[PDB]
Amino acid sequence: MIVSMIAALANNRVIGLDNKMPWHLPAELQLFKRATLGKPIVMGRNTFESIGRPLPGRLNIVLSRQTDYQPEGVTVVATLEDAVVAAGDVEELMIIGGATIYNQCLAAADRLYLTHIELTTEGDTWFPDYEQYNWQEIEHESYAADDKNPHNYRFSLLERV
Ligand SMILES: NC(=O)C1=CN([C@@H]2O[C@H](COP(=O)(O)OP(=O)(O)OC[C@H]3O[C@@H](n4cnc5c(N)ncnc54)[C@H](OP(=O)(O)O)[C@@H]3O)[C@@H](O)[C@H]2O)C=CC1
Ligand SMILES: CN(Cc1cnc2nc(N)nc(N)c2n1)c1ccc(C(=O)N[C@@H](CCC(=O)O)C(=O)O)cc1
């Protein structure tokens, strides 16, 4: 099983503000969907609340230590190890956030699916400093701003070296 993390970063690795993402960029969610459909997705409790529903076409695994926390349509696990057990023998597990989960799983990640957005915005959550490790890019895509998406963004799939 490949352990992958997927995130969208504005400048200075900002990923979140006030439990939402501080930009309007609907097409980027389509990128997220293409990259995660058919795979188990593992997330922290705040990220689940931010999404607001189980996502279709994916096994939704949510981390919480709250013993009575049990949203419909997701599997709640109390440890990372248990998340990995729920994911089963699949090709690739996708960690979809948020900061605390990214922090705990970075050292173990085989791939990062990063979208970089050309935007300086204030944050209260940041992606980890992945650049402390070595990576090679194995896929990439560029997306210039258009009438529905006001910022340039690009995709980079990194593999740990
Ligand atoms: N730009 C992007 O790509 C993304 C941005 N985001 C943003 O990230 C932010 C959310 O990140 P953050 O606040 O760090 O929260 P998370 O989504 O990482 O949720 C953290 C919660 O998960 C639970 N938890 C964490 N680690 C463990 C563990 N090892 N075992 C069991 N439970 C655990 C705890 O919940 P409990 O207290 O219930 O135990 C904890 O408070 C939001 O602003 C969101 O919009 C999120 C995803 C993608
Ligand atoms: C807040 N959030 C988390 C989120 C958003 N963008 C990301 N973007 C990247 N690149 N990586 C992430 N981990 C990521 N996570 C959300 C919110 C909504 C939907 C959502 O409704 N997505 C639909 C597609 C969009 C839609 O249905 O309107 C899907 O099927 O994946 C997903 C993630």
* CATH value at residue 70: 3.40.430.10
| Distance between CA atoms of residues 85 and 65, nearest Å | 16
Q: Which residue pairs from 142-149 have beta carbons closer than 8 angstroms and sit at least 24 positions apart in sequence?
A: 143/27, 143/31, 146/27, 148/26, 148/27, 149/24, 149/25, 149/26, 149/27, 149/28
The total of other beta-carbon atoms located within 10 Å of residue 101's CB is 21
Ligand nearest to the CA of residue 78, numbered in listed order? 1
Cα 32 from chain centre: 8
Residue 86 three-state SS: helix
Candidate from 6, 17, 25, 29 with most ligand 2 atoms within 8 A of CB, to mutate: 29
Please tell me the distance between residue 69's alpha carbon and the centre of ligand 2 in angstroms.
22
Residue 35 in contact with residue 94, Cβ under 8 Å?
yes
Q: What domain range includes position 108?
A: 1-161
| Distance between CA atoms of residues 96 and 98, nearest Å | 7
Does 63 contact ligand 2 (Cβ within 6 A)?
A: no
| Distance between CA atoms of residues 19 and 16, nearest Å | 6
Looking up tokens 């085989």, which residue turns up?
A: 110
User: What is the chain's length?
Assistant: 161
Q: Domain tally for the chain?
A: 1
Residue 43 Cα: closest atom of ligand 2: 13
Six token digits for residue 148: 């529905």
